[PDB]
Amino acid sequence: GPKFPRVKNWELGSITYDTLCAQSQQDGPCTPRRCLGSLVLPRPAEQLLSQARDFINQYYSSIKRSGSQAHEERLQEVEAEVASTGTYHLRESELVFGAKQAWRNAPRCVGRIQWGKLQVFDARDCSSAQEMFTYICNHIKYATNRGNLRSAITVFPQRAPGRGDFRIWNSQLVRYAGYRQQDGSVRGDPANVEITELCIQHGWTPGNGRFDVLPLLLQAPDEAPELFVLPPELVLEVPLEHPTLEWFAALGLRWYALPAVSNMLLEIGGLEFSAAPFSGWYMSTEIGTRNLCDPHRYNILEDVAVCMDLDTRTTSSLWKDKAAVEINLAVLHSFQLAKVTIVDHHAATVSFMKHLDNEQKARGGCPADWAWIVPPISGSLTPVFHQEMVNYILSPAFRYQPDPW
Amino acid sequence: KFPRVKNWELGSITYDTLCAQSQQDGPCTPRRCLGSLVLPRKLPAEQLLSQARDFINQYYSSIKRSGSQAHEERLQEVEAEVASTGTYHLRESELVFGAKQAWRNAPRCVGRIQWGKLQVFDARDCSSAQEMFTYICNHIKYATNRGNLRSAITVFPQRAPGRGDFRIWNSQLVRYAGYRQQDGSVRGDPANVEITELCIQHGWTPGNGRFDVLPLLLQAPDEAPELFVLPPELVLEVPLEHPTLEWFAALGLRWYALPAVSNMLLEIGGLEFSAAPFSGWYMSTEIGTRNLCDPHRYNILEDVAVCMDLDTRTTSSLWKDKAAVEINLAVLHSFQLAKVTIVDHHAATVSFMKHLDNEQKARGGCPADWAWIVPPISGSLTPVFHQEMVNYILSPAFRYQPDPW
Numbered sequence: 173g174p175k176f177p178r179v180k181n182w183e184l185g186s187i188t189y190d191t192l193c194a195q196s197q198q199d200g201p202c203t204p205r206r207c208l209g210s211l212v213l214p215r216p217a218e219q220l221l222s223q224a225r226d227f228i229n230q231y232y233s234s235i236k237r238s239g240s241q242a243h244e245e246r247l248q249e250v251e252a253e254v255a256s257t258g259t260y261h262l263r264e265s266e267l268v269f270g271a272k273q274a275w276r277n278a279p280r281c282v283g284r285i286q287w288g289k290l291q292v293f294d295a296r297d298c299s300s301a302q303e304m305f306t307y308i309c310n311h312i313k314y315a316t317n318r319g320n321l322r323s324a325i326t327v328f329p330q331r332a333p334g335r336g337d338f339r340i341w342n343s344q345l346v347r348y349a350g351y352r353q354q355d356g357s358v359r360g361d362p363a364n365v366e367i368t369e370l371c372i373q374h375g376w377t378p379g380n381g382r383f384d385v386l387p388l389l390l391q392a393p394d395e396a397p398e399l400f401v402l403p404p405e406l407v408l409e410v411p412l413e414h415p416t417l418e419w420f421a422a423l424g425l426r427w428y429a430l431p432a433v434s435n436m437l438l439e440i441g442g443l444e445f446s447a448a449p450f451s452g453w454y455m456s457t458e459i460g461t462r463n464l465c466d467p468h469r470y471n472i473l474e475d476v477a478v479c480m481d482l483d484t485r486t487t488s489s490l491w492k493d494k495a496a497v498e499i500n501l502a503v504l505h506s507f508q509l510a511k512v513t514i515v516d517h518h519a520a521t522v523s524f525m526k527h528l529d530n531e532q533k534a535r536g537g538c539p540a541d542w543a544w545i546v547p548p549i550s551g552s553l554t555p556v557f558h559q560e561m562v563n564y565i566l567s568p569a570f571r572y573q574p575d576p577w
Numbered sequence: 578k579f580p581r582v583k584n585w586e587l588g589s590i591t592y593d594t595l596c597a598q599s600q601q602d603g604p605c606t607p608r609r610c611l612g613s614l615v616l617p618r619k620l621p622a623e624q625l626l627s628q629a630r631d632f633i634n635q636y637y638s639s640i641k642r643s644g645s646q647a648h649e650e651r652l653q654e655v656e657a658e659v660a661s662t663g664t665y666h667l668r669e670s671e672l673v674f675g676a677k678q679a680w681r682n683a684p685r686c687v688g689r690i691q692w693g694k695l696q697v698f699d700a701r702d703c704s705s706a707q708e709m710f711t712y713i714c715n716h717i718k719y720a721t722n723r724g725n726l727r728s729a730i731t732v733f734p735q736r737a738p739g740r741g742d743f744r745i746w747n748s749q750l751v752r753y754a755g756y757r758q759q760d761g762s763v764r765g766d767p768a769n770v771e772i773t774e775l776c777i778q779h780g781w782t783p784g785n786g787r788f789d790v791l792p793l794l795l796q797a798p799d800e801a802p803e804l805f806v807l808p809p810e811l812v813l814e815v816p817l818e819h820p821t822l823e824w825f826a827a828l829g830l831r832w833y834a835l836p837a838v839s840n841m842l843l844e845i846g847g848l849e850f851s852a853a854p855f856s857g858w859y860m861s862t863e864i865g866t867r868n869l870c871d872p873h874r875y876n877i878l879e880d881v882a883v884c885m886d887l888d889t890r891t892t893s894s895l896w897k898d899k900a901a902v903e904i905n906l907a908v909l910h911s912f913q914l915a916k917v918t919i920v921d922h923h924a925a926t927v928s929f930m931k932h933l934d935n936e937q938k939a940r941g942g943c944p945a946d947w948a949w950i951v952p953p954i955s956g957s958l959t960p961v962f963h964q965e966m967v968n969y970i971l972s973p974a975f976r977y978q979p980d981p982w
């Protein structure tokens with residue numbers, strides 16, 4: 173057979189070979205002796221040049237111009253600029269291309285059928301933390317679009333030789349606060365405890381509800397961060413209710429429309445963009461299963477099961493399962509009622525299968541992280557569970573990065 | 578270097594140091610992770626010696642006897658045997674230890690808390706298919722123990738130089754037939770279509786039902802397989818009813834009490850046991866999710882959802898998730914009403930956590946395959962979902978092997 177990964181789908185009985193992985197420059201955490209695929213985070217000179225050269229080639233390739241004069245001219249111009257300034261800049265449409273690509277390359281994202289439709293806001297002119305606030309507000313305005321959501325990314329200035337990074341401290345543009353108590357517990361979203369304490373430490377006046385939208389903490393080159401509160405009318409939220417369980421409404425649960433990861437470094441041709449928030453729309457299970465049922469988040473399963481009158485003294489009643497289905501249902505219903513874009517884990521995964529097939533044709537593979545693509549309820553009930561997948565790092569990429577503090 | 582392994586629910590980190598013991602390579606390389614592939618792409622005297630020395634040192638260590646008189650004379654035995662015949666033989670108590678350690682090392686198995694309680698039948702004195710059938714019959718009889726299930730393995734003669742393997746052609750000792758219909762579709766378990774055909778092709782007259790217990794095809798070295806029908810009364814079956822929905826029963830669904838895998842190979846101290854069928858008891862989801870709801874299995878979701886009165890027409894109604902849940906519920910009710918051992922997915926993954934904990938203290942880790950340990954439903958609702966796991970091959974070991982035909 174071909175010596176590239178044989179990938180099988182056990183439901184359809186079909187084979188593909190992933191030849192795309194051959195392009196991976198970067199290595200991940202597995203070795204022949206032990207597989208580390210399940211861990212969340214696995215433990216410049218002439219280097220820049222070859223990262224840069226490869227990205228330009230991806231670009232010129234994508235516009236079908238490999239070998240052309242614009243192409244070799246562009247390669248020369250890049251290495252003249254690394255030659256003298258130790259770095260280089262990207263043309264506008266080179267940035268747009270690379271941003272989209274990073275998304276298309278992201279092994280953990282199930283929504284990639286949408287990769288070619290992303291609005292890229294150049295913000296490489298940004299000079300202050302004030303300015304960052306304006307762009308972010310603008311992004312949120314555009315992306316939200318009164319509930320009819322549009323995928324977008326804003327790109328702030330890249331990293332530079334001996335000059336401090338641009339950083340958004342928050343992990344998402346929109347996050348609920350988590351307050352620590354002496355009684356040990358956490359009010360709000362326990363994931364956000366640290367960023368909450370940090371905002372207070374930098375001079376925020378805390379609320380004290382389960383659902384207080386956090387202020388942004390925005391950092392500009394070689395400065396302490398600055399505090400910024402989102403105008404509430406910009407932050408669209410969805411109150412949660414059940415289509416038939418009248419009391420669910422009374423739990424006073426809510427969620428925000430816009431998922432906007434603000435802490436991930438965007439790497440393109442070796443240039444590093446530390447502040448480059450992107451947003452899409454949610455998949456039902458992110459809110460409904462992880463955010464609301466993780467034992468270390470809102471952990472509402474028990475509350476709800478009691479309301480449903482389930483027997484929670486025993487695992488074999490599948491009370492945890494019954495409550496979960498009904499919560500997910502409520503998330504979906506409430507967004508549909510509110511006319512805010514959402515996608516259920518079935519439709520979502522069905523579209524990823526379509527994505528897998530498009531990429532097979534186009535690139536000869538699609539890097540994908542199974543543990544992360546399979547939804548956290550109803551896994552085997554969805555087609556991706558039966559689909560083997562190869563994971564590998566391609567560049568451009570979205571990458572995790574150490575916290576500014 | 579040893580992997581930091583984090584639990585995300587509890588914030589606890591640990592370090593897996595056992596994996597340094599692993600001698601066999603897996604399918605992953607630093608360039609791409611093949612963690613989710615089911616089977617290997619792949620699938621001497623000096624080397625067997627070393628696998629055997631390593632195993633014997635293991636066995637004496639296990640009984641607190643390293644460097645004892647017994648230990649050294651046993652190594653010298655093996656020495657002499659191999660040096661002469663190109664091979665050697667295990668003592669019964671070594672086998673017993675080996676079988677146990679093989680289950681202990683099995684990364685895809687969530688029942689390993691049970692690893693020390695295994696009844697081991699030595700069947701290495703078997704010269705025909707007939708005898709195999711009598712051994713297979715005692716195993717079932719004992720394992721089943723009228724519903725109070727008990728874990729067993731039955732080890733037939735090891736492979737040898739230049740003669741056929743003892744093999745059980747069936748993938749489990751109890752499986753339902755799959756009959757192809759002229760119109761392409763399959764009546765009964767579609768994963769068993771091949772094994773069904775082979776049985777008709779060696780003289781078995783088929784049933785015409787969804788739930789026909791297949792015969793056994795048993796092969797002694799270099800003979801045509803022979804066919805044997807299991808006695809109806811040795812094969813315990815549960816009919817499927819549901820606690821509250823009366824029509825469910827009418828649906829006629831049944832399943833069998835004994836999960837007895839028969840197509841895998843047991844490797845101990847480099848000896849290979851080509852027929853070593855083992856059984857424990859079922860986890861509910863194996864049946865109620867996979868075997869009944871996989872689209873390429875009995876595929877019953879839509880039938881139920883229809884009976885359940887649900888909006889079949891759109892994915893947003895979560896009809897699948899809803900039906901899946903009842904179906905698992907009914908498997909659990911039905912087994913418990915028949916006083917036949919079953920473990921649910923919540924209880925099982927809770928006990929798998931304890932196991933991981935016991936093995937941390939005992940060995941410095943636990944080879945575990947995340948994608949196989951997380952149930953097919955309610956993933957993030959069990960504690961394993963949140964537990965990083967390192968996967969790798971330790972010996973003794975169950976391995977897959979080619980089909981004999």
Ligand code: HEM
Pocket residue numbers: 275278280281282283284286290323324325433436450451452453454455458515520544570
């Ligand atoms: C358009 C609608 C979209 C849907 C339904 C979608 C779906 C998802 C889901 C379910 C995850 C895993 C989330 C988790 O469990 O934490 C994910 C992760 C990711 N997505 Fe997408 N996505 C979409 C748009 C986008 C866009 C526009 C980008 C970037 C341009 C993106 C890039 C990523 C990245 C980088 C991750 C991994 C983040 C991490 O490792 O924590 N997503 N997305």
Ligand code: HEM
Pocket residue numbers: 680683685686687688689691695728729730841855856857858859860863920925949975
């Ligand atoms: C005590 C009752 C047991 C329970 C509840 C249990 C649970 C499981 C489950 C859910 C799987 C995944 C199975 C699948 O989806 O096909 C599994 C796999 C496995 N189990 Fe256990 N198990 C038990 C006993 C045992 C015993 C006694 C052995 C060997 C002596 C064993 C060896 C394995 C092996 C080799 C696999 C790999 C399956 C494969 O590759 O097909 N299990 N077990």
Ligand SMILES: C[C@]12CCCC(=O)C1=Nc1c(nc(N)[nH]c1=O)N2
Pocket residue numbers: 210211212543544545585962963964965
């Ligand atoms: C289950 C696992 C990987 C193992 C550890 C963990 O907590 C995870 N977390 C996430 C995951 N997948 C997604 N989409 N999101 C997670 O947070 N997969």
Ligand SMILES: C[C@]12CCCC(=O)C1=Nc1c(nc(N)[nH]c1=O)N2
Pocket residue numbers: 182557558559560613614615948949950
């Ligand atoms: C989903 C995956 C791994 C990927 C390929 C596949 O079809 C699987 N099959 C099984 C699995 N886990 C279990 N327990 N059993 C499977 O058959 N995990």
Ligand SMILES: NC(=[NH2+])NCCC[C@H](N)C(=O)O
Pocket residue numbers: 283344431432433451452453454455458459463
């Ligand atoms: N659909 C997305 N873009 N998700 C991005 C990750 C958001 C994060 N999982 C959340 O629930 O807020």
Ligand SMILES: NC(=[NH2+])NCCC[C@H](N)C(=O)O
Pocket residue numbers: 688749836837838856857858859860863864867868
């Ligand atoms: N509980 C076990 N040890 N099972 C072995 C696998 C059985 C297989 N999953 C089945 O449904 O028949």
Ligand SMILES: [Zn+2]
Pocket residue numbers: 202206207208209605609610611612
């Ligand atoms: Zn791996």
